[PDB]
Amino acid sequence: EDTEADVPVTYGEMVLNGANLVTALVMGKAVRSLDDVGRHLLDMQEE
Amino acid sequence: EDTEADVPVTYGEMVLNGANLVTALVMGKAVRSLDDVGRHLLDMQEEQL
DSSP: OOOSOOOOOOOOOOOOOSHHHHHHHTSSOOOTTHHHHHHHHTTTSOO | OOOOOOOOSOSOOOOOOHHHHHHHHTTSOOOTTHHHHHHHHHHHHHSOO
């Protein structure tokens, strides 16, 4: 028994905050973390 | 009653903007002027009636 105590965490949540509210409704698809993926896709082509 | 005045430009440039780029190639859909209607469905979201 290395110790008798451990370090867990709490829930991380995933809510339709911004653009995912439009894309779920105006479009169909609602790809997760589209606030970050859209930021990464708009950073690559302009160099 | 001749010599009318006309518009010279081909009216509009529907180009893939920052909203229509990320919507088209990822979500497989597009909307004409999602820049506008993405703001209007959220503007009447806070205050409606």
